């Protein structure tokens, strides 16, 4: 599913991401824009042979099982395919564990490079939330 910006903002809010670990909703929407362009089916292979899955490009190296990432963990206890669903519950639940890991949203290199320090509120501008 390709979410609309405010559609994804509303879904993330419903799932308790708004100000989760002190990260306002605009940070999460900004991360999703540059990770996946709001596409739940987004997949990208990493140089280390791990894969990133879904709206927030959650990595098989640590967080989900894809069966093809040697030496990896599955700390969200989910198949990586669950992260591609039109239903973002599994992506949100797993994002909560990642952002709690100690480095906050720096875990998302695209958030650090493209969203951190910017006017992230612009990403929820006009949305009925
Ligand atoms: Na894994």
GROMACS .gro file of N, CA, C and O in nm, residues 8-111:
model
  416
    8UNK      N    1  -0.097   0.834   0.657
    8UNK     CA    2   0.010   0.765   0.733
    8UNK      C    3   0.025   0.834   0.869
    8UNK      O    4   0.035   0.763   0.970
    9UNK      N    5   0.016   0.967   0.874
    9UNK     CA    6   0.025   1.044   1.001
    9UNK      C    7  -0.084   0.994   1.096
    9UNK      O    8  -0.055   0.970   1.215
   10UNK      N    9  -0.205   0.974   1.046
   10UNK     CA   10  -0.322   0.935   1.128
   10UNK      C   11  -0.300   0.793   1.179
   10UNK      O   12  -0.333   0.769   1.296
   11UNK      N   13  -0.246   0.705   1.095
   11UNK     CA   14  -0.225   0.561   1.126
   11UNK      C   15  -0.118   0.550   1.235
   11UNK      O   16  -0.137   0.476   1.334
   12UNK      N   17  -0.007   0.623   1.215
   12UNK     CA   18   0.104   0.628   1.314
   12UNK      C   19   0.054   0.682   1.447
   12UNK      O   20   0.095   0.629   1.552
   13UNK      N   21  -0.032   0.784   1.445
   13UNK     CA   22  -0.084   0.847   1.568
   13UNK      C   23  -0.171   0.746   1.642
   13UNK      O   24  -0.149   0.728   1.763
   14UNK      N   25  -0.264   0.684   1.571
   14UNK     CA   26  -0.356   0.580   1.626
   14UNK      C   27  -0.274   0.473   1.699
   14UNK      O   28  -0.316   0.436   1.811
   15UNK      N   29  -0.157   0.435   1.644
   15UNK     CA   30  -0.066   0.330   1.695
   15UNK      C   31   0.036   0.385   1.798
   15UNK      O   32   0.125   0.306   1.836
   16UNK      N   33   0.022   0.511   1.843
   16UNK     CA   34   0.094   0.565   1.960
   16UNK      C   35   0.238   0.604   1.930
   16UNK      O   36   0.322   0.608   2.023
   17UNK      N   37   0.267   0.639   1.805
   17UNK     CA   38   0.403   0.682   1.766
   17UNK      C   39   0.426   0.831   1.794
   17UNK      O   40   0.543   0.871   1.812
   18UNK      N   41   0.320   0.911   1.793
   18UNK     CA   42   0.324   1.057   1.816
   18UNK      C   43   0.388   1.083   1.952
   18UNK      O   44   0.327   1.050   2.055
   19UNK      N   45   0.509   1.137   1.953
   19UNK     CA   46   0.585   1.173   2.075
   19UNK      C   47   0.632   1.047   2.147
   19UNK      O   48   0.668   1.057   2.266
   20UNK      N   49   0.638   0.933   2.078
   20UNK     CA   50   0.696   0.809   2.136
   20UNK      C   51   0.847   0.829   2.151
   20UNK      O   52   0.913   0.870   2.052
   21UNK      N   53   0.901   0.800   2.269
   21UNK     CA   54   1.042   0.829   2.306
   21UNK      C   55   1.072   0.977   2.277
   21UNK      O   56   1.188   1.012   2.262
   22UNK      N   57   0.971   1.064   2.279
   22UNK     CA   58   0.985   1.209   2.264
   22UNK      C   59   1.001   1.254   2.120
   22UNK      O   60   1.031   1.376   2.098
   23UNK      N   61   0.970   1.167   2.025
   23UNK     CA   62   0.978   1.200   1.881
   23UNK      C   63   0.839   1.237   1.827
   23UNK      O   64   0.754   1.148   1.809
   24UNK      N   65   0.817   1.366   1.800
   24UNK     CA   66   0.689   1.416   1.746
   24UNK      C   67   0.654   1.341   1.618
   24UNK      O   68   0.744   1.291   1.547
   25UNK      N   69   0.525   1.343   1.586
   25UNK     CA   70   0.470   1.268   1.470
   25UNK      C   71   0.542   1.305   1.341
   25UNK      O   72   0.569   1.214   1.258
   26UNK      N   73   0.577   1.432   1.321
   26UNK     CA   74   0.642   1.479   1.198
   26UNK      C   75   0.774   1.407   1.174
   26UNK      O   76   0.811   1.389   1.061
   27UNK      N   77   0.849   1.380   1.280
   27UNK     CA   78   0.974   1.298   1.269
   27UNK      C   79   0.947   1.160   1.206
   27UNK      O   80   1.029   1.115   1.125
   28UNK      N   81   0.840   1.092   1.248
   28UNK     CA   82   0.808   0.956   1.201
   28UNK      C   83   0.764   0.963   1.055
   28UNK      O   84   0.806   0.880   0.973
   29UNK      N   85   0.681   1.062   1.022
   29UNK     CA   86   0.632   1.078   0.882
   29UNK      C   87   0.750   1.114   0.790
   29UNK      O   88   0.762   1.058   0.679
   30UNK      N   89   0.835   1.206   0.833
   30UNK     CA   90   0.959   1.244   0.761
   30UNK      C   91   1.047   1.119   0.741
   30UNK      O   92   1.087   1.093   0.630
   31UNK      N   93   1.070   1.040   0.845
   31UNK     CA   94   1.149   0.915   0.830
   31UNK      C   95   1.085   0.825   0.724
   31UNK      O   96   1.156   0.778   0.635
   32UNK      N   97   0.954   0.800   0.734
   32UNK     CA   98   0.879   0.714   0.640
   32UNK      C   99   0.891   0.767   0.497
   32UNK      O  100   0.913   0.687   0.406
   33UNK      N  101   0.883   0.899   0.476
   33UNK     CA  102   0.893   0.958   0.341
   33UNK      C  103   1.025   0.918   0.276
   33UNK      O  104   1.025   0.866   0.165
   34UNK      N  105   1.136   0.939   0.346
   34UNK     CA  106   1.271   0.918   0.288
   34UNK      C  107   1.315   0.771   0.296
   34UNK      O  108   1.402   0.731   0.212
   35UNK      N  109   1.255   0.689   0.383
   35UNK     CA  110   1.287   0.544   0.389
   35UNK      C  111   1.213   0.473   0.274
   35UNK      O  112   1.274   0.387   0.209
   36UNK      N  113   1.085   0.502   0.251
   36UNK     CA  114   0.996   0.415   0.170
   36UNK      C  115   0.911   0.495   0.073
   36UNK      O  116   0.839   0.427  -0.005
   37UNK      N  117   0.911   0.629   0.082
   37UNK     CA  118   0.812   0.712   0.008
   37UNK      C  119   0.670   0.665   0.045
   37UNK      O  120   0.579   0.662  -0.046
   38UNK      N  121   0.649   0.620   0.168
   38UNK     CA  122   0.517   0.581   0.223
   38UNK      C  123   0.462   0.452   0.158
   38UNK      O  124   0.340   0.417   0.177
   39UNK      N  125   0.552   0.374   0.100
   39UNK     CA  126   0.523   0.242   0.038
   39UNK      C  127   0.552   0.128   0.137
   39UNK      O  128   0.675   0.098   0.163
   40UNK      N  129   0.447   0.058   0.182
   40UNK     CA  130   0.460  -0.056   0.277
   40UNK      C  131   0.542  -0.167   0.209
   40UNK      O  132   0.600  -0.247   0.282
   41UNK      N  133   0.538  -0.179   0.077
   41UNK     CA  134   0.605  -0.294   0.007
   41UNK      C  135   0.753  -0.264  -0.024
   41UNK      O  136   0.818  -0.350  -0.087
   42UNK      N  137   0.807  -0.149   0.018
   42UNK     CA  138   0.948  -0.109  -0.006
   42UNK      C  139   1.044  -0.215   0.054
   42UNK      O  140   1.024  -0.256   0.170
   43UNK      N  141   1.137  -0.263  -0.027
   43UNK     CA  142   1.250  -0.351   0.014
   43UNK      C  143   1.377  -0.294  -0.048
   43UNK      O  144   1.373  -0.251  -0.165
   44UNK      N  145   1.488  -0.295   0.027
   44UNK     CA  146   1.621  -0.251  -0.020
   44UNK      C  147   1.726  -0.342   0.043
   44UNK      O  148   1.724  -0.357   0.167
   45UNK      N  149   1.813  -0.398  -0.041
   45UNK     CA  150   1.928  -0.481   0.005
   45UNK      C  151   2.038  -0.390   0.056
   45UNK      O  152   2.074  -0.294  -0.012
   46UNK      N  153   2.096  -0.425   0.171
   46UNK     CA  154   2.212  -0.353   0.230
   46UNK      C  155   2.342  -0.420   0.180
   46UNK      O  156   2.341  -0.540   0.147
   47UNK      N  157   2.453  -0.348   0.184
   47UNK     CA  158   2.587  -0.399   0.143
   47UNK      C  159   2.623  -0.526   0.219
   47UNK      O  160   2.690  -0.614   0.158
   48UNK      N  161   2.584  -0.537   0.347
   48UNK     CA  162   2.619  -0.653   0.433
   48UNK      C  163   2.534  -0.776   0.399
   48UNK      O  164   2.552  -0.878   0.470
   49UNK      N  165   2.441  -0.768   0.302
   49UNK     CA  166   2.350  -0.877   0.259
   49UNK      C  167   2.221  -0.884   0.340
   49UNK      O  168   2.136  -0.969   0.309
   50UNK      N  169   2.203  -0.798   0.441
   50UNK     CA  170   2.075  -0.784   0.512
   50UNK      C  171   1.982  -0.708   0.419
   50UNK      O  172   2.033  -0.652   0.320
   51UNK      N  173   1.852  -0.706   0.449
   51UNK     CA  174   1.748  -0.632   0.374
   51UNK      C  175   1.667  -0.545   0.472
   51UNK      O  176   1.639  -0.584   0.589
   52UNK      N  177   1.627  -0.429   0.423
   52UNK     CA  178   1.536  -0.334   0.489
   52UNK      C  179   1.394  -0.355   0.433
   52UNK      O  180   1.375  -0.362   0.309
   53UNK      N  181   1.296  -0.356   0.522
   53UNK     CA  182   1.156  -0.389   0.484
   53UNK      C  183   1.058  -0.282   0.531
   53UNK      O  184   1.060  -0.243   0.647
   54UNK      N  185   0.971  -0.236   0.442
   54UNK     CA  186   0.848  -0.167   0.480
   54UNK      C  187   0.862  -0.015   0.495
   54UNK      O  188   0.963   0.040   0.459
   55UNK      N  189   0.758   0.049   0.547
   55UNK     CA  190   0.749   0.199   0.554
   55UNK      C  191   0.869   0.259   0.626
   55UNK      O  192   0.904   0.372   0.593
   56UNK      N  193   0.927   0.188   0.722
   56UNK     CA  194   1.041   0.241   0.801
   56UNK      C  195   1.167   0.157   0.777
   56UNK      O  196   1.265   0.176   0.850
   57UNK      N  197   1.171   0.076   0.670
   57UNK     CA  198   1.297   0.011   0.624
   57UNK      C  199   1.374  -0.053   0.742
   57UNK      O  200   1.499  -0.028   0.760
   58UNK      N  201   1.302  -0.140   0.811
   58UNK     CA  202   1.350  -0.214   0.930
   58UNK      C  203   1.435  -0.330   0.877
   58UNK      O  204   1.388  -0.406   0.787
   59UNK      N  205   1.554  -0.343   0.936
   59UNK     CA  206   1.667  -0.424   0.886
   59UNK      C  207   1.655  -0.566   0.944
   59UNK      O  208   1.636  -0.578   1.067
   60UNK      N  209   1.676  -0.667   0.858
   60UNK     CA  210   1.680  -0.812   0.891
   60UNK      C  211   1.806  -0.849   0.973
   60UNK      O  212   1.804  -0.961   1.025
   61UNK      N  213   1.908  -0.763   0.976
   61UNK     CA  214   2.035  -0.783   1.054
   61UNK      C  215   1.999  -0.799   1.202
   61UNK      O  216   2.062  -0.882   1.269
   62UNK      N  217   1.896  -0.729   1.253
   62UNK     CA  218   1.865  -0.721   1.398
   62UNK      C  219   1.719  -0.754   1.432
   62UNK      O  220   1.696  -0.815   1.536
   63UNK      N  221   1.623  -0.715   1.348
   63UNK     CA  222   1.483  -0.689   1.394
   63UNK      C  223   1.382  -0.792   1.343
   63UNK      O  224   1.283  -0.817   1.412
   64UNK      N  225   1.403  -0.849   1.224
   64UNK     CA  226   1.303  -0.944   1.169
   64UNK      C  227   1.374  -1.064   1.106
   64UNK      O  228   1.493  -1.051   1.075
   65UNK      N  229   1.302  -1.175   1.086
   65UNK     CA  230   1.357  -1.294   1.019
   65UNK      C  231   1.318  -1.294   0.871
   65UNK      O  232   1.197  -1.294   0.839
   66UNK      N  233   1.418  -1.301   0.784
   66UNK     CA  234   1.393  -1.324   0.639
   66UNK      C  235   1.457  -1.455   0.590
   66UNK      O  236   1.449  -1.482   0.470
   67UNK      N  237   1.523  -1.530   0.678
   67UNK     CA  238   1.587  -1.658   0.643
   67UNK      C  239   1.712  -1.648   0.558
   67UNK      O  240   1.768  -1.754   0.526
   68UNK      N  241   1.758  -1.530   0.522
   68UNK     CA  242   1.873  -1.518   0.430
   68UNK      C  243   1.970  -1.412   0.482
   68UNK      O  244   2.041  -1.348   0.401
   69UNK      N  245   1.974  -1.390   0.614
   69UNK     CA  246   2.067  -1.291   0.673
   69UNK      C  247   2.152  -1.361   0.779
   69UNK      O  248   2.115  -1.359   0.896
   70UNK      N  249   2.263  -1.426   0.738
   70UNK     CA  250   2.347  -1.507   0.827
   70UNK      C  251   2.396  -1.429   0.948
   70UNK      O  252   2.447  -1.320   0.931
   71UNK      N  253   2.378  -1.487   1.067
   71UNK     CA  254   2.431  -1.432   1.193
   71UNK      C  255   2.341  -1.325   1.248
   71UNK      O  256   2.383  -1.254   1.341
   72UNK      N  257   2.223  -1.306   1.188
   72UNK     CA  258   2.134  -1.193   1.219
   72UNK      C  259   2.051  -1.228   1.344
   72UNK      O  260   2.047  -1.347   1.381
   73UNK      N  261   1.981  -1.130   1.402
   73UNK     CA  262   1.877  -1.156   1.505
   73UNK      C  263   1.739  -1.121   1.448
   73UNK      O  264   1.730  -1.064   1.335
   74UNK      N  265   1.636  -1.155   1.525
   74UNK     CA  266   1.493  -1.128   1.499
   74UNK      C  267   1.433  -1.072   1.628
   74UNK      O  268   1.346  -1.138   1.684
   75UNK      N  269   1.481  -0.955   1.672
   75UNK     CA  270   1.446  -0.896   1.804
   75UNK      C  271   1.299  -0.850   1.808
   75UNK      O  272   1.242  -0.846   1.918
   76UNK      N  273   1.233  -0.825   1.694
   76UNK     CA  274   1.088  -0.795   1.694
   76UNK      C  275   1.006  -0.922   1.685
   76UNK      O  276   0.884  -0.909   1.694
   77UNK      N  277   1.072  -1.039   1.671
   77UNK     CA  278   1.005  -1.172   1.668
   77UNK      C  279   0.898  -1.177   1.558
   77UNK      O  280   0.782  -1.205   1.586
   78UNK      N  281   0.933  -1.138   1.436
   78UNK     CA  282   0.834  -1.131   1.324
   78UNK      C  283   0.906  -1.175   1.198
   78UNK      O  284   1.024  -1.144   1.182
   79UNK      N  285   0.835  -1.234   1.100
   79UNK     CA  286   0.891  -1.249   0.966
   79UNK      C  287   0.900  -1.110   0.902
   79UNK      O  288   0.814  -1.026   0.925
   80UNK      N  289   1.004  -1.086   0.824
   80UNK     CA  290   1.027  -0.954   0.763
   80UNK      C  291   0.908  -0.921   0.673
   80UNK      O  292   0.874  -0.804   0.661
   81UNK      N  293   0.842  -1.022   0.618
   81UNK     CA  294   0.726  -1.005   0.526
   81UNK      C  295   0.612  -0.933   0.599
   81UNK      O  296   0.536  -0.862   0.533
   82UNK      N  297   0.597  -0.952   0.731
   82UNK     CA  298   0.493  -0.885   0.813
   82UNK      C  299   0.508  -0.734   0.803
   82UNK      O  300   0.407  -0.662   0.821
   83UNK      N  301   0.628  -0.687   0.771
   83UNK     CA  302   0.663  -0.542   0.767
   83UNK      C  303   0.621  -0.483   0.631
   83UNK      O  304   0.639  -0.360   0.612
   84UNK      N  305   0.564  -0.564   0.542
   84UNK     CA  306   0.526  -0.516   0.407
   84UNK      C  307   0.374  -0.507   0.397
   84UNK      O  308   0.325  -0.460   0.291
   85UNK      N  309   0.303  -0.541   0.503
   85UNK     CA  310   0.155  -0.547   0.506
   85UNK      C  311   0.095  -0.406   0.488
   85UNK      O  312   0.161  -0.304   0.520
   86UNK      N  313  -0.027  -0.400   0.436
   86UNK     CA  314  -0.102  -0.272   0.423
   86UNK      C  315  -0.134  -0.220   0.563
   86UNK      O  316  -0.158  -0.099   0.578
   87UNK      N  317  -0.134  -0.309   0.663
   87UNK     CA  318  -0.156  -0.281   0.807
   87UNK      C  319  -0.020  -0.255   0.871
   87UNK      O  320   0.061  -0.350   0.884
   88UNK      N  321   0.004  -0.132   0.918
   88UNK     CA  322   0.138  -0.091   0.969
   88UNK      C  323   0.160  -0.134   1.114
   88UNK      O  324   0.265  -0.097   1.167
   89UNK      N  325   0.070  -0.209   1.178
   89UNK     CA  326   0.087  -0.247   1.320
   89UNK      C  327   0.228  -0.308   1.343
   89UNK      O  328   0.297  -0.264   1.440
   90UNK      N  329   0.269  -0.407   1.265
   90UNK     CA  330   0.397  -0.478   1.292
   90UNK      C  331   0.514  -0.381   1.275
   90UNK      O  332   0.606  -0.390   1.353
   91UNK      N  333   0.511  -0.294   1.176
   91UNK     CA  334   0.618  -0.193   1.154
   91UNK      C  335   0.624  -0.100   1.275
   91UNK      O  336   0.734  -0.072   1.322
   92UNK      N  337   0.509  -0.050   1.321
   92UNK     CA  338   0.506   0.045   1.436
   92UNK      C  339   0.561  -0.024   1.560
   92UNK      O  340   0.646   0.037   1.626
   93UNK      N  341   0.513  -0.145   1.589
   93UNK     CA  342   0.548  -0.218   1.713
   93UNK      C  343   0.699  -0.238   1.716
   93UNK      O  344   0.760  -0.216   1.823
   94UNK      N  345   0.754  -0.273   1.599
   94UNK     CA  346   0.898  -0.302   1.586
   94UNK      C  347   0.978  -0.170   1.592
   94UNK      O  348   1.080  -0.168   1.660
   95UNK      N  349   0.930  -0.061   1.529
   95UNK     CA  350   0.990   0.074   1.537
   95UNK      C  351   1.000   0.123   1.683
   95UNK      O  352   1.100   0.192   1.715
   96UNK      N  353   0.900   0.091   1.766
   96UNK     CA  354   0.901   0.124   1.910
   96UNK      C  355   1.022   0.058   1.977
   96UNK      O  356   1.087   0.123   2.064
   97UNK      N  357   1.050  -0.067   1.942
   97UNK     CA  358   1.165  -0.139   2.002
   97UNK      C  359   1.295  -0.076   1.950
   97UNK      O  360   1.385  -0.050   2.028
   98UNK      N  361   1.303  -0.045   1.821
   98UNK     CA  362   1.428   0.012   1.762
   98UNK      C  363   1.459   0.144   1.831
   98UNK      O  364   1.573   0.165   1.879
   99UNK      N  365   1.363   0.235   1.833
   99UNK     CA  366   1.385   0.373   1.883
   99UNK      C  367   1.415   0.372   2.033
   99UNK      O  368   1.462   0.475   2.083
  100UNK      N  369   1.383   0.263   2.104
  100UNK     CA  370   1.411   0.246   2.248
  100UNK      C  371   1.551   0.188   2.271
  100UNK      O  372   1.591   0.174   2.388
  101UNK      N  373   1.626   0.157   2.165
  101UNK     CA  374   1.752   0.077   2.172
  101UNK      C  375   1.867   0.161   2.228
  101UNK      O  376   1.967   0.101   2.262
  102UNK      N  377   1.856   0.294   2.232
  102UNK     CA  378   1.961   0.378   2.294
  102UNK      C  379   1.999   0.498   2.209
  102UNK      O  380   2.033   0.604   2.269
  103UNK      N  381   1.992   0.485   2.076
  103UNK     CA  382   2.032   0.596   1.985
  103UNK      C  383   1.911   0.668   1.929
  103UNK      O  384   1.932   0.753   1.842
  104UNK      N  385   1.792   0.643   1.981
  104UNK     CA  386   1.672   0.717   1.939
  104UNK      C  387   1.650   0.696   1.790
  104UNK      O  388   1.675   0.582   1.742
  105UNK      N  389   1.612   0.801   1.717
  105UNK     CA  390   1.583   0.784   1.572
  105UNK      C  391   1.709   0.788   1.486
  105UNK      O  392   1.694   0.766   1.363
  106UNK      N  393   1.830   0.802   1.544
  106UNK     CA  394   1.958   0.795   1.469
  106UNK      C  395   1.973   0.656   1.405
  106UNK      O  396   2.053   0.645   1.312
  107UNK      N  397   1.902   0.555   1.456
  107UNK     CA  398   1.899   0.419   1.399
  107UNK      C  399   1.860   0.427   1.251
  107UNK      O  400   1.900   0.341   1.171
  108UNK      N  401   1.774   0.522   1.217
  108UNK     CA  402   1.733   0.549   1.077
  108UNK      C  403   1.830   0.650   1.015
  108UNK      O  404   1.824   0.770   1.049
  109UNK      N  405   1.927   0.602   0.939
  109UNK     CA  406   2.033   0.694   0.887
  109UNK      C  407   1.963   0.804   0.804
  109UNK      O  408   2.007   0.917   0.819
  110UNK      N  409   1.856   0.773   0.730
  110UNK     CA  410   1.781   0.873   0.648
  110UNK      C  411   1.715   0.978   0.739
  110UNK      O  412   1.705   1.096   0.697
  111UNK      N  413   1.667   0.939   0.857
  111UNK     CA  414   1.613   1.037   0.955
  111UNK      C  415   1.728   1.129   0.998
  111UNK      O  416   1.712   1.249   0.995
   0.00000   0.00000   0.00000
